[PDB]
Structure formats: C-alpha cells, structure tokens
Amino acid sequence: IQKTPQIQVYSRHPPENGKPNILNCYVTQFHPPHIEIQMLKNGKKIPKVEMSDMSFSKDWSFYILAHTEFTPTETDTYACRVKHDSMAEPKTVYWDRDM
Amino acid sequence: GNYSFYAL
Amino acid sequence: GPHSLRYFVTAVSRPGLGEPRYMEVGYVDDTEFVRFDSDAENPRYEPRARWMEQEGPEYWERETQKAKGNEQSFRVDLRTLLGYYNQSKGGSHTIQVISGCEVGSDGRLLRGYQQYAYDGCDYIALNEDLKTWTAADMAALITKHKWEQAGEAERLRAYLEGTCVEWLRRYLKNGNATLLRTDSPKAHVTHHSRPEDKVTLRCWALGFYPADITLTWQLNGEELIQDMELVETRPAGDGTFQKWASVVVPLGKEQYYTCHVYHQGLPEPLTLRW
Ligand SMILES: *[C@@H]1O[C@H](CO[C@@H]2O[C@@H](C)[C@@H](O)[C@@H](O)[C@@H]2O)[C@@H](O)[C@H](O)[C@H]1NC(C)=O
Ligand SMILES: *[C@@H]1O[C@H](CO)[C@@H](O)[C@H](O)[C@H]1NC(C)=O
C-alpha cells in the first residue's frame, strides 16, 4: 500500500506511418492515488490528453488511462512520464511500436 | 444514479 | 448477458493544501459513463458516454447535488477515521468505495454490493444478503454498530434492489447501441529474439468489446497457462479493449505453438501461429 505503478504504452491500432491512431498510457496497480502523468511527443508535452477509465482492483490499487489521438511517423518518439511517491524520480516509458 | 452516502 | 452498474468513489486528504480531493466514476459494464471531480474548476457531474445526452438538465443538477452531499460525508469520514485510528492530522489518507448492482439478461437483480477501504485496506463491506455488514477491524466495528442502530442497511438494500436496478435498466435501454454491441477481436503474433536459442512469441488481441476475453498458448493440445506472461485486459481509448499473452519457446520450434482467442464476438475461437 505503497505500490509502484506499472506503466503500459500502446496504440489502439497496429501503427502505420501517416495513419491516424490513438496512443494510450495505462498506469496501474498503484497506491497512494496521487500521481502525475504526462504524454510526450519527441520529449514535448502533448496538449489535450484525455484522462479516463479510473478504477481500482480487488486489492484497492488504482488504475487510470491517459490517451490522445496521434499520427505516427517512422522517427517520432512517444513516451509516458509518471511521477509517484513510490519513485524518487519520474519514470519515462517509451512506446515500443514493435512489441 | 449513485447512492447517497452517510458518514461512517 | 448480465450487466452491472458500478461507482468507484475516492476521497483523499491533503493536509496543508485545502480540502480533500473527491471523485466519483460510474461504469455500466466496462464502459465509463459519468464522473465527478472536485478539482475541476466548477465541479459538476458530467457525462462520459454519448448516450448520457439522453438525460435532461434535471438529472445533471440532481446528481451533482448528490455528489456534493457525498463529498461532504467523505470529508467528515476522513476526520472521523483519524479519531478511530488515533492518527495525526498531518498525513494524507484515502477512502475508497465500490458500490453497485448487477442484473441478469432479464433485468432482475443478481447481486448488490458496497465495500469500503481505508489506506488501501479493507474497512467494511455489505454481506451478500444485503442485511448486515462485515467489519475488518475494530474501527470498522464502530461504523457497523452506528449503521445498525441508524437503519442504514435497510436504506442501502432499498437502493441496491430498487433504485440501482431501475437506473441500470434505463442506462442499458438508452445506451443499447453502445452497451449491447459486440466488437470482435482481431489478433496477431509478434516474435522477438532472446539470448540463448529461445524466442518470445506474443499473441495480441485488439479492438474488442466487452472486455472479458481469454488468450491461451498451446503446445501439443495442452495449454501453457504456467509458462505464459500476460497483461491485464486494458482500455484502448475508444471504448474497446486489448490484451496480449506471451510464451518463450525454443528457436526453430515456433510452428508447434498456437495462440487461442475466445470472446463473445468470436463464434469459433481464433487459432493462430507465428
Ligand atoms: C437500440 O434501441 C433502439 C430503440 O430504443 C430507443 O432509441 C434508443 C437509441 C434509446 O434512445 C432508447 O431509449 C429508445 O427507446 C432501436 O431503434 C435500435 O435499433 C437499437 N440499436 C441497436 C444497435 O440494436
Ligand atoms: C494516541 O497516540 C498517542 C501517540 O501518538 C498516544 O499518546 C495516545 O495515548 C494514543 N492513544 C491510544 C488510545 O492509543
């Protein structure tokens, strides 16, 4: 019940360069609830990210989704940066389009 | 519609 | 099939930073449909699903007032719990509640529930019979005794058997095009090298609704549930869900392993290989 977040980054559709899509950062299994979540394109904060799907599991840990529309290209990078009291420094998790 | 909670 | 109405309620104190943060988030099945967040600039109950546009202004006003009333009860609760547990005023604490009901395909009640946690640990829960509570510690026993003398279980049972069920039926009626749909999974397998002559095979299921799904890997007709890694089913930003499951296999033997996908939108389960 200090539980460190699991951070998962994934697209809605298999990525195709130049095709609109949705990028997700699902931050899960964490406690306490205070948290900061940012989505980054080439290291710059993406504006208008939607937060949704807040819930908790049977063990009371928190879950929440950040998502945004995006159009991938070959070399733009995307990441989700999370600050939580369980970690000394923010954790940045990159989208792995080949997973 | 949610419940109207009372204090514990 | 059966359906559920669930509210996830959270109150979090923040000593030195003003009033607690208070949130309610409602779901019909796996679909978020309403929310209240005290940290919004002018906090109000808000729709989260398109079909909630079918509720008129009076709904939003009434549910907003209810949320504000609930917010006040949880503010008092945070203070009360410091007393029950003999804790100081300087630390942040959390109350969580899950509340709701489930109905069968015919709209009749299957079950109701309401369970509380304090700092991420069970506090008090309504028993399945909807008549008594069970308390996890001596603080919760004080609550149980208060609620018993006040007739709280009768009020809660009336909500769960009546109001909750009636609202759930209405939401299913209004949101039928969204809530009663089935979106079939689309699946694929990715492959990754490892040190040693092994490979990771990852089976993906994308674009599905509802969220319940089963992914398995088999070898020789036997499921490998032990050898598998997986992620919990997760929302994908448009009201659908996704999942993956992986296994590590010997290089050159990938052909013997099959991924199987079972879902309400798959008349026959999918079988796929790398
Ligand atoms: C969903 O139900 C429709 C009829 O019900 C009504 O229209 C819906 C959208 C709600 O507003 C409800 O309160 C009304 O009574 C059917 O016309 C329609 O075909 C159904 N849609 C699907 C996908 O089955
Ligand atoms: C409450 O905590 C304080 C120590 O912080 C102690 O002096 C006091 O006696 C405690 N009360 C009980 C009932 O344990």
The topology under which CATH files domain C182-274 is Immunoglobulin-like (2.60.40)
Cis preceding linkage at C235, omega within 30: no
Run of H or E residues at B6: none
Distance CA A67, CA C82 (A): 37
State this model's resolution in angstroms: 1.4
C-alpha distance from residue C78 to each of A31, A61, B3, C173, C225 (Å): 17, 19, 19, 37, 43
Contact C171, C28 (CB under 8 A): yes
Rg (CA), chain B: 7
Q: How many CA atoms lie within 13 A of C188 on its CB side?
A: 8
Residue C65, SS3 per DSSP:
helix
Q: What does the alpha-carbon distance between residue A57 and residue C29 come to, in Å, rounded to a whole number?
A: 15
Q: Which residue has the tokens 């679909």?
A: C31
Q: Give per-residue burial for A3-14: e unless 16+ CB within 10 Å, then b.
A: bebebbbbbbee
The 8-class DSSP code of residue C88 comes to: -
CB half-sphere exposure, C195, CA atoms < 13 A = 0
At C104, list the tokens.
């069968």
Q: How long, in residues, is chain B?
A: 8
According to DSSP, the residues that pair with A65 across neighbouring strands are: A26, A52
User: What would you report as the CA-atom Rg of chain C, rounded to the nearest whole angstrom?
Assistant: 23
| Solved with | X-ray
- The residue to which tokens 């009333």 are assigned: C69
Pocket probe mutation, ligand 1, options C54, C176, C178, C181, max atoms within 8 Å of Cβ: C176
Q: Which H or E run includes C191?
A: strand C186-193
What amino acid occupies position C18? Answer: G
- Structure-block tokens of residue C105: 């395909």
> Dihedral of CA C213/C217/C222/C224: which sign?
negative
Closest CA to C54 of C181, C210, C177, C238: C177
Q: Which residue has the tokens 């319940």?
A: C212
Rounded Cα gap, residues C160 and C33, in angstroms: 19
> Where do the H-state alpha helices sit in C206-269?
none
Interface of C with B (CB under 8 A): 7, 9, 24, 26, 63, 66-67, 69-70, 73-74, 76-77, 80-81, 97, 99, 114, 116, 123-124, 143, 146-147, 150, 152, 156, 159, 163-164, 167
Q: How far apart are CA C7 and CA C96, in angstroms?
A: 10
Instruction: Parse chain C into domains and list their residue ranges.
Output: 1-181, 182-274
Shortest-distance Cα residue to atom 19 of ligand 1: C177
Asked if residue A20 has a cis previous peptide bond (ω within 30° of 0), the answer is no
- Alpha carbons C24 and C166: distance in angstroms, whole number: 20
Give dist(CA C30, CA C212) in Å, integer.
Answer: 9
The long-range contacts involving C244-247, CB below 8 angstroms and separated by at least 24 positions, are C244/A99, C244/C202, C244/C203, C244/C204, C244/C205, C244/C215, C245/C202, C245/C203, C245/C215, C245/C216, C245/C217, C246/C200, C246/C201, C246/C202, C246/C203, C246/C217, C247/C200, C247/C201, C247/C217
Q: What is the 3-state secondary structure (H, E, C) of chain A?
A: CCECCEEEEEECCCCCCCCCEEEEEEEEEEECCCCEEEEEECCEECCCCEEEEEEECCCCCEEEEEEEEECCCCCCCEEEEEECCCCCCCEEEECCCCC
SS3 sequence, C70-85? HHHHHHHHHHHHHHHH
| Residue A96 near residue A57 (C-beta atoms within 8 A) | no
Decide: A30 and A4 in contact? Cβ < 8 Å: yes
Domains and CATH numbers, chain A: 1-99 (2.60.40.10)
Contact in structure between A11 and A59 (CB atoms under 8 Å): no
- Is the preceding peptide bond at A15 cis, omega within 30 degrees of 0? no
Fold of C1-181: 3.30.500
- Here the tokens at position A67 are 């998502």
Q: Do A61 and C242 touch (CB under 8 A)?
A: no
Q: Please tell me the distance from the alpha carbon of residue C12 to that of residue C101, in angstroms, as a whole number.
A: 25
d(CA C204, CA C193): 17
Tokens found for residue A10: 């994934």
First to last CA, chain A: 30
Which strand ranges, in their side-by-side order, compose the sheet holding A91-94?
A44-45, A36-41, A78-83, A91-94
Q: What is the DSSP letter of C20?
A: P
Torsion of CA C17, C19, C20, C25, to 10 degrees: -120
In sequence order, which ranges of chain C are alpha helices (DSSP H)?
57-85, 138-150, 152-158, 164-174, 176-179
- Which two structure tokens, joined as six digits, stand for C152? 């709280």
From C192, C217, C191, select the one nearest C270 (Cα to Cα). Answer: C217
> What are the pocket residues of ligand 1 if the criterion is a CB atom closer than 6 Å to any ligand atom?
C 54, 173-174, 176-177
CA distance A82 to A47: 16
Q: Confirm if C110 and C2 have CB atoms less than 8 A apart.
A: yes
The order of strands in the sheet holding C257-262 is C222-223, C214-219, C257-262, C270-272
- C207 φψ region: left (φ > 0), alpha (ψ -120 to 50), beta (else): left
